[PDB]
Design a protein around this ligand. Structure first.
Ligand code: PEE
Lengths: 71, 59
């Protein structure tokens, strides 16, 4: 009466299975990376230029006050 | 049929050499591995709460 019933794949088979290596390239050129590094270095250099000159002026002002108080 | 696993030849043009030098100096693949680990932290763990939860079995 009852037909055979055992573990079999479904009709038409299973869905395709991926096996190829998948290592995508994120994407950024070495020239671009070096340019970003140089640009951030230059920006830091300029900002610290300005801040260090201001610090020199502040130190000179403190020295002026000390000179005034010295006698 | 057979495949080659390590039979690639790196390009010797200026752009490729600069790319490899940028990789050497800025540690790009190390950052890629760090990113893989960081992403893998933010996913749910596979640990079950034994003995309150039990591993699957079969008849
Ligand atoms: C216009 C004026 C500008 C003046 C010029 C300035 C330009 C600067 C350009 C170059 C700067 C790059 C220097 C940075 C250090 C590079 C050193 C280096 O590349 O050494 C590596 C080695 O580097 C390493 O392997 C270190 C890896 C150690 C593991 C650490 C993981 C790295 C990721 C952690 C995050 C780093 C965070 C950095 C910021 C910290 C902030 C406190 C070479 O080794 P190999 O590739 O094996 O080749 C040698 C055989 N010939």
């Amino acid at each position: 009466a009852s037909k055979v019933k055992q573990d079999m794949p479904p009709p038409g088979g299973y869905g395709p299975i991926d096996y190829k290596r998948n290592l995508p390239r994120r994407g950024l050129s070495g020239y671009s990376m070096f340019a970003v590094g140089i640009g951030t270095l230059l920006f830091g250099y300029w900002s610290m230029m300005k801040w260090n000159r201001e610090r020199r002026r502040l130190q000179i002002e403190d020295f002026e006050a000390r000179i005034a108080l010295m006698p | 049929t057979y495949k080659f696993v390590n039979m690639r030849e790196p390009s010797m043009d200026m752009k490729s050499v600069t790319d490899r030098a940028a990789q050497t100096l800025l540690w790009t693949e190390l950052v890629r591995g760090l990113g893989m680990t960081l992403s893998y932290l933010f996913r749910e763990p596979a640990t079950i709460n034994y003995p309150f939860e039990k591993g699957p079995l079969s008849p």
